[PDB]
């Protein structure tokens, strides 16, 4: 009885990097913070002192 | 007359140890005064605290502490270029003591004097111990710091 909605994800049909730099910067930024939110916090490493 | 001969500075002389590596490292949100950095620096490698969350800087902490005790940044001294090429008249503390003496003579005489120092090697060690045991004298009124 199941069903699911296909979240479509076609490519940057807008080549948003050609001349629009202004916005790419804003994207990168975004995608970047997004990343840090992940990037596993490290573990145990030679006590500073 | 002093400025006419040795010039003047357009800067303040670091008198809080703010520009030392240890301080930068500590900057944890805590902020230890020059006195604390001075006492801490005078400690053994094992003891040297970084309890807060985190070198031979030992010279700089003392410099800031000494300059603070000489109000080299307040009064009229703040207008004197204490690193003036002209202020040759001298032949760390021995030097600063040498500079202050020459400047003060200048103010109270209009003429200059040249100082020579033949401090024995033996005497330096005794003096070195004294350097890390200097206490203060609070009086804030002396405050002349205007510019």
From Swiss-Prot, chain B:
Compartment(s) of residence: Virion
Spans through the membrane: none
Subunit structure of this chain's protein: Interacts with VP3 (Potential). Interacts with VP2; this interaction activates VP1. Interacts with NSP5; this interaction is probably necessary for the formation of functional virus factories. Interacts with NSP2; this interaction is weak.
Role this protein plays: RNA-directed RNA polymerase that is involved in both transcription and genome replication. Together with VP3 capping enzyme, forms an enzyme complex positioned near the channels situated at each of the five-fold vertices of the core. Following infection, the outermost layer of the virus is lost, leaving a double-layered particle (DLP) made up of the core and VP6 shell. VP1 then catalyzes the transcription of fully conservative plus-strand genomic RNAs that are extruded through the DLP's channels into the cytoplasm where they function as mRNAs for translation of viral proteins.
Family per similarity comment: Belongs to the reoviridae RNA-directed RNA polymerase family.
Protein's recorded name: RNA-directed RNA polymerase
Provenance organism: Rotavirus A (strain RVA/SA11-Patton/G3P[X])
